[PDB]
């Protein structure tokens, strides 16, 4: 059992090496900074087209269009300034639990219990949205997908693996295999040279899409990690888990900085997102409302409480003007 | 206050019309979540019905459109995607009667049935319970006592008694007997009787859901 115990003997020295860098806590550092005000966002828009629970949404890079997937078999693309439905794509499988909108805006992606990542072309010579590609390599439910560009996409799946595809050929050019539980969430770095994946083994892993290897593992949580998102700097990220706790990990420090939890919250987090400056952490809970946390002081800044069911998805625009919450009550709400 | 935004609004309203029509069409479907602890039994009932992830079988019985979702190809954590089937009309649970001597296997069937029946997502969704391989349990008990699975079972090992004991041992697993019903059928050789039983069980589930919708129950 030599090489079966050298593993935790390396784990002990990883812990001892990342404990020597813990000289002052993020609380001790950001103690003297002024707390944010009372973050009181009023709902500005309500999107009322979906007929079943909404499982995912994603903003466009123009901060106006947004795609949302619901288990009524629909993928609706909304113009959020006017609540106009730009598109309504009917999916081959109603069991969709993720969606992504390409940075160029030409393509959207969806996936779920069918084990397929469907890439839909929005801008065709005809007037309809066409199924551009179907990526069919995963053996477990596909829980997240994120476009790198028009040709590459990274998907996370319930077969405990992530994958980097190229859409033109339809094969996956890289597979990321470190997790031991279902990979539930995925976030791309701002430069798209790295990405974090949070799984059901209560861990997040930092992968690099070029060399296709795991660089760091973060193991602070106690239950399944459902959401993950980089800090806008790209040098940190935040995870939300089923243990009713969000928390911030730093890549360079290789450990945890802050824990965002309250006694009154005993419900898991379904979605996590950062403000444009990164000062506010938006966490969607399944106690029917979203919480706004002071990311630097762990103070609970505000509550967004307009939904009648679980808040399943959350996203802040690229210009930081608004935050869209999609819930299981079949409604999307824009807050500002 | 609108120049060609008017045409975009008209397109959005047409999309809304199409979405409403699709929703009304889908609300007439009967969705059945097909569960079990092995495809040996589940595979023989999809053949009874009219003709890689989730497998949807769409068929029509007596001008009723059933969509039956078999999810046994998902070797993932069930708790992470089972809530997708919260609004399913019914659950068709298939257990084999002949796995009371195999490996312990009947006890795993019970574990799965108890985990599914007592979810927080299936508090109202009733269960159609199929006891498959009626003809193998028929002649197994002559040469294999039932007590290998049920040490506390005191009774003759005749089919009519030993099968009813299993049926009660399964119907005594739901902790909520006032919100859902378990419809139990002993899967028979005949082609049409199983789908007739499913049709009858779905008719009750629809009647009891309508009584709740109309505020009478």
């Amino acid at each position: 059992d030599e090489l079966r115990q050298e593993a935790e003997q390396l784990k002990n020295q990883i812990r001892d090496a990342r404990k020597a860098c813990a000289d002052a806590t993020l609380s001790q550092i950001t103690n003297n900074i002024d707390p944010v005000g009372r973050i009181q966002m009023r709902t500005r828009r309500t999107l009322r087209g979906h007929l079943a629970k909404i499982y995912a949404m994603h903003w466009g890079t123009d901060s106006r269009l947004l795609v949302s997937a619901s288990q009524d078999g629909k993928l609706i693309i909304w113009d959020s300034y006017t609540t106009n439905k730009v598109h309504a794509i009917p999916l081959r499988s109603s069991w969709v639990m993720t969606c992504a909108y390409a940075p160029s805006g030409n393509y959207v992606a969806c996936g779920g219990l069918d084990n397929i990542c469907s890439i839909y072309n929005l801008k065709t010579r005809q007037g309809n949205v066409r199924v551009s590609r179907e990526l069919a390599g995963h053996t477990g439910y596909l829980s997240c997908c994120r476009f790198l560009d028009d040709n590459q996409i990274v998907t996370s799946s319930g077969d405990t693996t992530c994958a980097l595809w190229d859409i033109e050929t339809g094969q996956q050019t890289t597979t990321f295999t470190g997790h031991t539980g279902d990979v539930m969430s995925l976030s791309l770095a701002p430069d798209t040279r790295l990405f974090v994946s949070g799984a059901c083994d209560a861990s997040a892993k930092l992968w690099d899409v070029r060399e296709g290897m795991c660089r760091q593992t973060f193991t602070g949580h106690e239950s399944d990690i459902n959401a993950i998102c980089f800090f806008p700097d790209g040098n940190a990220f935040a995870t939300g888990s089923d243990d009713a706790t969000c928390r911030l990990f730093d890549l360079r420090a290789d450990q945890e900085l802050m824990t965002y939890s309250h006694d009154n919250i005993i419900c898991g987090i379904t979605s996590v997102s950062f403000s444009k400056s990164g000062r506010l952490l938006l966490a969607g809970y399944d106690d029917f409302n979203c919480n706004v946390w002071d990311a630097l002081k762990a103070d609970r800044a505000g509550v967004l409480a307009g939904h009648d069911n679980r808040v399943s998805c959350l996203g802040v625009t690229d210009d930081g003007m608004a935050v869209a919450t999609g819930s299981w009550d079949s409604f999307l709400k824009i807050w500002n | 206050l609108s120049a060609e935004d008017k045409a975009a609004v008209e397109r959005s309203k047409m999309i809304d019309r199409n979405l409403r029509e699709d929703g009304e069409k889908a609300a007439r479907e009967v969705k059945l979540l097909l569960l079990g602890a092995g495809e040996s039994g589940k595979s023989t009932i999809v053949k009874q019905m009219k003709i890689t992830g989730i497998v949807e079988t769409h068929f029509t019985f007596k001008d009723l459109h059933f969509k039956m979702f078999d999810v046994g190809g998902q070797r993932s954590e069930r708790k992470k995607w089972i809530h997708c089937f919260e609004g399913v009309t019914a659950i068709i649970f298939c257990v084999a009667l002949s796995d009371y001597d195999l490996v312990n296997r009947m006890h795993e069937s019970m574990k799965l049935f108890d985990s599914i029946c007592n979810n927080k997502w299936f508090t109202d969704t009733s269960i159609i319970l199929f006891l498959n391989k009626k003809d193998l349990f028929e002649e197994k008990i002559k040469k294999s006592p039932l007590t290998i699975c049920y040490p506390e079972y005191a009774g003759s090992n005749t089919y009519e008694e030993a099968a009813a004991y299993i049926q009660c041992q399964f119907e005594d697993l739901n902790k909520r007997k006032d919100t859902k019903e378990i419809y139990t059928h002993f899967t028979c050789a005949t082609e049409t009787k199983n789908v007739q039983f499913v049709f009858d069980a779905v008719t009750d589930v629809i009647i009891k859901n309508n009584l709740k919708d109309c505020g009478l129950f």
């Epitope: 269009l65 113009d79 730009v86 005809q126 007037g127 | 120049a3 060609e4 008209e10 047409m14």
Partner: single-chain antibody
Framework: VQLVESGGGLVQPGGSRKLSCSAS????????MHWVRQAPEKGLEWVAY????????YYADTVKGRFTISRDDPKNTLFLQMTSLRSEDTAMYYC??????????????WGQGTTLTVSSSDIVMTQATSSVPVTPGESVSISCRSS???????????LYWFLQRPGQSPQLLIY???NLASGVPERFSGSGSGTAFTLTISRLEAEDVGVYYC?????????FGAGTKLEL
């Protein structure tokens, strides 16, 4: 994508005709459709419009009452029934597809046109020039001027630039005053503010020669500029 127009021909002044437009290669049901005439040796004149789903219909005041535009989606046909034809309805009629959503490119495809020969508060878009001589390689600017300001409160200016090459149907170059249509080379650039607009060709080729039309889509009836032609 393809639109084929049929039905035109020699008519007596007072008679009636039925022009048809068979669509092919695109989702005809999702596209609003326009009839746009062009009189012999004159410029484009918008005739009629029927929306997707036939829920909205507009006519030019010179054809309101006489012409009726209809649409039968399952066989993908657009109809213009023209009654009480008079000697100045003689023209070539183009069938134009036009889709309207956020970021869409309306007026993107034009049919080949069918010739009709009837025998014997609007926004005024002004193209001050009528014809300019060009040499391949050099840049050129075409100026359009509107009576009302085409800039709207929602931020986008509704100016469209089309090019009609000799012997061909018009081709959309620029939509909403600054956006290049798909398939248009990047030599063309549209600028302007409110009432004065410019189209710039960075370097002329043998395939940029033709008549350039500016159109307003701020409000109906859609009006065109007189058209100024590049020529070698």
């Amino acid at each position: 994508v393809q639109l084929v127009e049929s039905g035109g021909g020699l008519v007596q002044p007072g008679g009636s005709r039925k022009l048809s437009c068979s669509a092919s290669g695109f989702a005809f049901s999702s596209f609003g459709m326009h009839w746009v005439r062009q009189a012999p040796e004159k410029g484009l004149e918008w005739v009629a419009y029927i929306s997707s789903g036939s829920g909205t219909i507009y006519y030019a005041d010179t054809v309101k009452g006489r012409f009726t535009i209809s649409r039968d989606d399952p066989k993908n046909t657009l109809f213009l029934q023209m009654t009480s034809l008079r000697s100045e309805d003689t023209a070539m009629y183009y069938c134009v597809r036009s889709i309207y959503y956020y970021g869409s490119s309306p007026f993107d495809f034009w049919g080949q046109g069918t010739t009709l020969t009837v025998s014997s508060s609007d926004i005024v878009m002004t193209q001050a020039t009528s014809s300019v001589p060009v040499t391949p390689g050099e840049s050129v600017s075409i100026s359009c001027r509107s009576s009302k300001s085409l800039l709207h409160s929602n931020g986008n200016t509704y100016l469209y630039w089309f090019l009609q090459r000799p012997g061909q149907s018009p081709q959309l170059l620029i939509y909403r005053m600054s956006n290049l249509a798909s398939g248009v080379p990047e030599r063309f650039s549209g600028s302007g503010s409110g009432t004065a607009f410019t189209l710039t060709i960075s370097r002329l080729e043998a395939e940029d020669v033709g008549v350039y039309y500016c159109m307003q889509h701020l409000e109906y009836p859609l009006t065109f500029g007189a058209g100024t032609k590049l020529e070698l």
